[PDB]
Structure formats: structure tokens, C-alpha cells
Amino acid sequence: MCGTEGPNFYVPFSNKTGVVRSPFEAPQYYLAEPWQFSMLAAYMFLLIMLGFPINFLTLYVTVQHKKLRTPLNYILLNLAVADLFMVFGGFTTTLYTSLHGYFVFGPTGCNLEGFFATLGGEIALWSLVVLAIERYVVVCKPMSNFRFGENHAIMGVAFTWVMALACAAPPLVGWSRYIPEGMQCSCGIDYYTPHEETNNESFVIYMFVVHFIIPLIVIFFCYGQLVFTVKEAAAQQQESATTQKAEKEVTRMVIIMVIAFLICWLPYAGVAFYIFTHQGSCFGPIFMTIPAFFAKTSAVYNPVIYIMMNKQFRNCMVTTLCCGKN
């Protein structure tokens, strides 16, 4: 008997003591000490203080510099919006609920936070995928007579919205469900409960295949062929020191991006491999949600990697932060 079941929630704590309470009604201080909820609050505060400026500044600097408004950069703006969904839909709400020690907005707010937090994270996920596909098309030139235009970049953005809705919306209609997860202060997809009435098992498989395996294969294929194409072309121009420098930094950046993607991706795979095997034992509120606890940080380091390290964005932000000088 691992936890306590109830309508619209699963508390990862046995009720044999009788101390369990609804995560919508009363604080869950048997799951964790109050200071650990405070540390959860401090972590959300860290993510808000670092996440909102970086992502809002990305939207703001784009308004001040014409050179940034390239179609290849539209997907990076879509990434910055998605992170803001995570920052205001998820991190802000969770900071507030954390300090109460339970999800005070009830099951209705659970679907709101769940949707928008899941939507924001999903849009970011597919934006990284779409950027990889866009860069692969532009460099490797797989189509004979193709030019990447404004119309094409818009489809890529809309495509993320469709994919993110494909994951964040079914839990509201009847396929899986949103419940308080971990310490019960935030809400998300329910892969902790084999809820037959919403076919949780089929949604977890669909999530694992479409939104967890496909994004990885695409990112690895696109960036692989790109580094292959770039290293192939540079080999024909070894007389050019700059071409070799460009090839080196492109390879280094692709590695950083792919490593970063794996840092958010592998925890969910290690924890799941601890569900395919080692399935019997109960999982504390921390363990099932260790991957989530660190995947939230993507709202900070993804704009650092994909935007802050972009050569044009960087100088423009310095100019904007410095009131036009330097």
C-alpha cells in the first residue's frame, strides 16, 4: 500500500496512520518537512528570477534590433514564449502553493497549471526539434530547389503548438489526467497511477513514443547529418583557416545542444528504466519527480545556450542593457 487514493489525486504516502489529507484541502507536511517546502519555494524563486529576465529580454531585444527578425530566429522567439508559460503558469503558481504546503487552487487550478506548464514545456521541446530540422534543411540542402522563407518558419512555430496541444489537451478531455505530483504543490500528467478509467497506460506509451523518443531521434539525425555535412565541406577547403574554425565551433555547439538535450531527457529515461525493471517498490514523492525537478531548469539554460550564445543576440542585449552604448 504505497500511498492514498482519492478522487482527482494520489498522495504518495500510506494512510495507515490516518494523517493523510487531500492535496487540495490541507498541507502535505507528512510528505516533507515544512523547510523542504520552503526550499521548493526557494528553487521556484530562483527559476523565476533567472527565467523571466532572460526570456523576456529575448523578446524585448528582438523588438529593438532589425537584424534579429530573421525567419530562422522565429522559432527561438517561440522558445522564449514557451519558457514564459513555464515561468508564470508553473513556477509562479508552485511558489505560491509551496508556501501553503498544498495545492490551494483545487482541482480546477490543477488542470490550469497542469495544462499551461505542460504546454509551455512541450512547446519548448518541439521548438528545439523544429530548430534542429530547420538548421538541417538549410545546411544539408536535402531538397533540390528550396529556400527557407518567412512562410516556412511560421509553419514550424504552428507545428509546435499543434504538437504541444496534442500532449497537453488530451488529459482535459479524458485521456490520462492532471493530478498534484511529487509534494502535491504542482500538477502534471499522471503517470503515477494506472487509472483504467482514463487509459493512463496508453497515454504513457503515446507520450514515451511520440514526445520522448521521436524528438530525440530527430535531433540526433538532423544535427548528425549537419556536423557530417559541415565537416565534409570543410575538408575540401583545408586551406581556409576560418572554415576550419567555423567547422570547429559548429561541431562544438551541436555537441553542447545535444548534451543539453540529453541532460533534460535522460533523467526521465533512467527513472522509467526504474519502472520497467525494479517495478514493485513504492516511489517517494521525490523519486518519480526527480526528472521534473531538474527539467524545470531548462527554462534558464536553454535560452543561455540557444540565444545568449548566439553572436547577434548577445551584442544586441549588451546594447539594450547599456542604453545604446557598447
Ligand X SMILES: *C(=O)CCCCCCCCCCCCCCC
Ligand Y SMILES: *[C@@H]1O[C@H](CO)[C@@H](O[C@@H]2O[C@H](CO)[C@@H](O[C@@H]3O[C@H](CO[C@H]4O[C@H](CO)[C@@H](O)[C@H](O)[C@@H]4O)[C@@H](O)[C@H](O[C@H]4O[C@H](CO)[C@@H](O)[C@H](O)[C@@H]4O)[C@@H]3O)[C@H](O)[C@H]2NC(C)=O)[C@H](O)[C@H]1NC(C)=O
Ligand Z SMILES: CC(C)[C@H](C(=O)N1CCC2(CC1)Oc1ccccc1O2)c1ccccc1
Annotated binding-site ranges for Zn(2+): 201, 279
Helix (H) or strand (E) holding 210: none
**Least distance to ligand Y from the beta carbon of 31, Å?**
12
Q: Which does 326 bind (CB under 5 to 8 A by kind): ligand Y, ligand Z, ligand X, none?
A: ligand X
Q: Which does 247 bind (CB under 5 to 8 A by kind): ligand Z, ligand Y, ligand BOG, none?
A: none
Contact yes or no for 320/69 (Cβ under 8 A): no
Q: Is 156 exposed, middle or buried (0-12, 13-18, 19+ CB in 10 A)?
A: buried
Does residue 286 bind ligand BOG (CB under 6 A)? yes
**Distance spanning both ends of the chain, measured CA to CA:** 63
Contact yes or no for 4/11 (Cβ under 8 A): yes
Stretch that binds ligand BOG, among 58-66, 137-145, 203-211, 258-266 (CB under 6 A): 258-266
* Residue stretches of the annotated binding site: 201, 279
Stretch that binds ligand Y, among 17-25, 144-152, 215-223, 299-307 (CB under 6 A): 17-25
Neighbours of 170 (CB within 10 A): 18
**Least distance to ligand X from the beta carbon of 85, Å?**
24
Does residue 88 bind ligand BOG (CB under 6 A)? no
Neighbours of 301 (CB within 10 A): 16
Helix (H) or strand (E) holding 47: helix 34-64
Does residue 28 bind ligand BOG (CB under 6 A)? no
Binding mask 80-119 for ligand Z (x = CB under 6 A): --------------------------------------x-
Report the site for ligand X in 292-321 (rule: CB under 6 A): 318, 321
DSSP annotation string for 120-137: HHHHHHHHHHHHHHHHHH
